[PDB]
């Protein structure tokens, strides 16, 4: 289970361990914790709200 998700909108980190990404970035999802997901993009890791992405099947 390494799910892939595409950013529907850009999101800027609120905290030091939040992920930064731009609209259309493809994020690798490592963990799902209800409304917050942990993942990786552009070599960086962090948390982000799942509402900002859509799973790529």
């Amino acid at each position: 289970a390494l799910l892939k998700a595409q950013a529907l909108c850009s999101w800027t980190a609120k905290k030091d361990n939040h992920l930064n990404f731009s609209k259309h970035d493809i994020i690798t999802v490592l963990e799902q914790q209800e409304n917050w997901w942990f993942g990786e993009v552009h070599g960086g890791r962090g948390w982000f709200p799942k509402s900002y992405v859509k799973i790529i099947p």
Binding site: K15, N17, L30, F38, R45, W47
Partner: peptide, 12 residues
């Protein structure tokens, strides 16, 4: 990855 501080700190 589950031992990274980024992960362990959690989203809040």
């Amino acid at each position: 990855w589950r031992g990274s501080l980024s992960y362990l700190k959690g989203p809040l």
